[PDB]
Amino acid sequence: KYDQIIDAAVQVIAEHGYHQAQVSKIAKAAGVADGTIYLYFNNKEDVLISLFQEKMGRFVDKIRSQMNEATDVEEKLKILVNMHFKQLAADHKLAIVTQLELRQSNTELRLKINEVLKGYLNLLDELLMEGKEKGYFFQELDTRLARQMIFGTLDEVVTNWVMKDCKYDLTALVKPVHQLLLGGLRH
Amino acid sequence: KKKGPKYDQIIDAAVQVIAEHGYHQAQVSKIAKAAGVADGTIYLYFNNKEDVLISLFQEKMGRFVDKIRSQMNEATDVEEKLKILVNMHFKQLAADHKLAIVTQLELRQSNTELRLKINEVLKGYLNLLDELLMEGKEKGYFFQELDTRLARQMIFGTLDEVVTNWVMKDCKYDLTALVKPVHQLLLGGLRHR
Numbered sequence A: 001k002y003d004q005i006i007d008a009a010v011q012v013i014a015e016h017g018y019h020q021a022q023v024s025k026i027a028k029a030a031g032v033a034d035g036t037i038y039l040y041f042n043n044k045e046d047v048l049i050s051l052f053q054e055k056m057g058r059f060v061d062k063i064r065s066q067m068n069e070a071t072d073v074e075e076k077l078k079i080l081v082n083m084h085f086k087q088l089a090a091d092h093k094l095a096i097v098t099q100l101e102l103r104q105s106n107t108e109l110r111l112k113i114n115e116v117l118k119g120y121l122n123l124l125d126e127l128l129m130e131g132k133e134k135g136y137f138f139q140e141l142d143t144r145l146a147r148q149m150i151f152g153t154l155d156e157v158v159t160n161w162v163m164k165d166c167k168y169d170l171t172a173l174v175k176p177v178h179q180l181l182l183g184g185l186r187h
Numbered sequence B: 001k002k003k004g005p006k007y008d009q010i011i012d013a014a015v016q017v018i019a020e021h022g023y024h025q026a027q028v029s030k031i032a033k034a035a036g037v038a039d040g041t042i043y044l045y046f047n048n049k050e051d052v053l054i055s056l057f058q059e060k061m062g063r064f065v066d067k068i069r070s071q072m073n074e075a076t077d078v079e080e081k082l083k084i085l086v087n088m089h090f091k092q093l094a095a096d097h098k099l100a101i102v103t104q105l106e107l108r109q110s111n112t113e114l115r116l117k118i119n120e121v122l123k124g125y126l127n128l129l130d131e132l133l134m135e136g137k138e139k140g141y142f143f144q145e146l147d148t149r150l151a152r153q154m155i156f157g158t159l160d161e162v163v164t165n166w167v168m169k170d171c172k173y174d175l176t177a178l179v180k181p182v183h184q185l186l187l188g189g190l191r192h193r
Ligand SMILES: CCCCCCCCCCCCCCCC(=O)O
Pocket: A055, A056, A058, A059, A084, A087, A088, A098, A099, A102, A103, A104, A113, A117, A120, A155
């Protein structure tokens, strides 16, 4: 019942956009009464934020599990890149939500979205610190800048794919993005 | 094609109003007051708020890219040229915090057709990036098997993300102190430097 509301919210926000999405449309798409939505969510903002928290929480947990099992820090990065691309290539509507509708100019809304994103960003920080401690990455590497390079590059590749109607295979870019982030531009 | 003489004052006012009150609350009345003009003077130049926003973005990007292109043309080394590009990106926004609020926060809108127009303006800077990468490959400075498209996305996505983070921190530190480290990081990735 909570899960069908989450699913419906993705659908409705992707189709109509966040500002034109009404919680009543979400309830109709979920097969629930207007009132069933407010048992879980104070309102429409709490719907967008909760949907993001739910999807991010599950993503981060899966990546952490898969990484905790990997043997090599470069493979841990690959896992992260692969899961980021795979999960969105699996759900075009959630990609429209992440790439397009969670990008808000409202200051209070923007700050709440960013707080949810810190879960992913902190997992990057952990990976970067691990790679510096273990010697895969250079000692002087600036963790925060590197996080911004990794997340900013991944997010930019995904956005361009969404902007091109998801018409090529996003998952075919895992290997070259991973190689580019490890090696940089230089010959 | 030349601009009328009230162009700059309207667009400069628009940057101020949009940065201060945000795009949604920005109104042509407020832009006119900040520009020192009657409302009707705005509509001689621009149809509505959106038109003010895309015009300013286009005009400014065109000059930004032209300045990069000529500073780069004076260099030899394409190491230098990438450093020129990073430095001019960060410099232009560090020189105008209100324009940075506009570019990083306010010009990020879910209006599908505004979004399309903004991307078309951005393509000019992305083509410059592509030229640099092509050059660097041809002269052996960048990895020969590099995909220009992906490399462009990494450079732009990185620079944009660094600038956004500085804007979300009220522009309180000197963004141009990150020029060298971003430059180096783009060249060596996680593994090298
Ligand atoms: C199938 C698992 C679903 C989870 C997929 C979400 C993982 C990719 C999310 C990337 C985060 C991008 C959101 C950025 C938020 C913002 O800046 O507005």
